[PDB]
């Protein structure tokens, strides 16, 4: 399942969407009392869950006859919040937005409820702004694809992200990309992000000790790069920093064999998978230094040029094949990674961005690293395993899961707005 809280949040409202909605689904009249009463109902709920997450942040900082909060022992997978959800406002909000309490016939959805958790964790972030002493954003990080622009895509430069991100660097928040796609080298960033570093070049808004507040790291977790402007000449762009710079300890401790058969034995997996399945020879397997993958190819032949994909039940057979095998081998369970479905490719990356986020909130400011409560990760990838190489961001900080590049630039809109 893809998230076993918001698939719980569903079933509770199931019960008064029945009784006070479907029970009104052949009413003649009296619409707008009988969509009070169930927005009513829904938010009761919206504010209990509310109470059982402030209660769970209560249970997780000091530390029930039964060890666990709440909230735990409901939804035994459930992960940890950093900040509290105002989840009965958020309700109240995207309710006016998308009239899920005026529905008779189709239930509150997980998109409904995934939608209302985003809004809710915005809300929270927006409120800290007007607090004094306020628990305020100090990073905001960023899956690539699907998240700046269409999966495999790049950032161009009238993509309507980019007056957001520059916006956020101008308030004197710290913005990562943080995203699988693994280079060794500024090059190939430089062109994928084209559009975003001429517009933050060509910026007169904002010094440029702020401009150099934007970052990526690639590979999930293994190429750190910082935006740079030398006046000097026309000359600006990405350059890497050293690892021993910023690797984590924990990551400076892994073996390198390790991290090696790790990589090979996922290589060899991958090959194995690639003759049982009997793939296209056009499919490709790519070895790099901290990652191995399989992608689509493509032909000639209309008199046309077509690609040669890999089947969605072939790409789920390889990535459960994958994750599960390095799950069970005693070198990959000696370090990190994090295997993922694409959507349209498989990969397996050294570490995670779990990892990477965390790397960056010591990296930005190393004698008080920013804390999960300060942190944002915007991605779409948020299921436990497949389309999972965000989900492990959930441990570093706060999370936005969003489905479309049109989503990220909706939620930052709100999240940077007036009010
Ligand atoms: O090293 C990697 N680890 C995981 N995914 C990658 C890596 N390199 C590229 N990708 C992703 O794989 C796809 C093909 O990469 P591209 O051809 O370099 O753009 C894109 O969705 C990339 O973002
Ligand atoms: O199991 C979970 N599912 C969905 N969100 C979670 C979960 N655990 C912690 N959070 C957090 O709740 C906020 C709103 O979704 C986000 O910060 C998310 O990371
Ligand atoms: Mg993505
Ligand atoms: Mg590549």
């Not at 309700?91 to 985003?118: C, G, K, Y």
């Not at 924990?250 to 090959?271: P, Q, Y």
Request: hydrophobic residues 35%; charged residues 25%; glycine residues 6%.
């Amino acid at each position: 399942r893809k998230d076993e809280f918001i698939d719980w949040v569903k079933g509770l409202l199931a019960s008064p969407f029945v009784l006070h909605a479907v029970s009104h689904e052949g009413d003649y009249n009296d619409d707008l009392a009988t969509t009070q009463r169930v927005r009513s109902q829904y938010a009761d709920i919206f504010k209990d869950i509310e109470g059982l997450i402030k209660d769970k942040i209560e249970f997780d900082s000091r530390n029930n006859i039964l060890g666990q909060s709440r909230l735990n022992l409901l939804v035994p997978s459930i992960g940890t919040f950093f900040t509290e959800l105002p989840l009965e406002q958020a309700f109240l909000w995207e309710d006016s937005q998308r009239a899920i309490s005026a529905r008779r016939m189709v239930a509150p959805s997980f998109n409904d409820i995934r939608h209302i958790l985003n809004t809710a964790q915005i809300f929270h972030f927006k409120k800290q702004e007007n607090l004094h002493n306020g628990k305020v954003l100090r990073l905001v990080t960023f899956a690539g694809d699907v998240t700046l622009y269409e999966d495999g895509g790049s950032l161009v430069y009238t993509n309507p992200v980019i007056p957001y991100i520059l916006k956020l660097l101008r308030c004197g928040i710290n913005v990562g990309i943080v995203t699988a796609a693994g280079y060794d080298e500024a090059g190939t960033y430089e062109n994928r992000l084209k559009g975003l570093i001429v517009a933050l070049h060509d910026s007169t808004d904002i010094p440029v000790s702020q401009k150099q507040n934007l970052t990526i790291m690639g590979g999930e977790s293994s190429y750190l790069f910082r935006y740079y402007e030398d006046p000097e000449e026309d000359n600006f762009g990405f350059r890497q920093i050293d690892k021993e710079e910023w690797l984590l300890p924990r990551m400076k401790a892994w073996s390198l064999e390790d991290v090696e058969k790790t990589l090979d034995f996922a290589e060899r997996t991958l090959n194995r998978l690639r003759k049982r399945l009997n793939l296209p020879s056009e499919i490709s397997i790519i070895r790099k230094v901290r990652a191995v993958g399989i992608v689509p190819g493509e032909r000639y032949d209309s008199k046309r040029q077509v690609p040669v994909k890999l089947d969605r039940e072939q790409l789920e057979e390889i990535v459960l094949t994958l994750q599960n095998t390095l799950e069970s081998f005693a070198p990959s369970r000696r370090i990190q990674f994090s295997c993922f479905d694409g959507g349209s490719d498989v990969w397996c990356d050294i570490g995670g961005k779990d990892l990477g986020v965390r790397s960056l909130q010591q990296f930005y400011n190393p004698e008080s690293p920013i804390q999960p409560s300060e942190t944002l990760h915007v991605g779409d990838q948020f299921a436990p395993v497949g389309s999972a190489n965000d989900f492990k961001a959930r441990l570093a900080g706060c999370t936005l899961w969003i489905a479309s590049p049109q989503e990220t630039v909706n939620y930052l809109h709100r999240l940077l707005e007036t009010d």
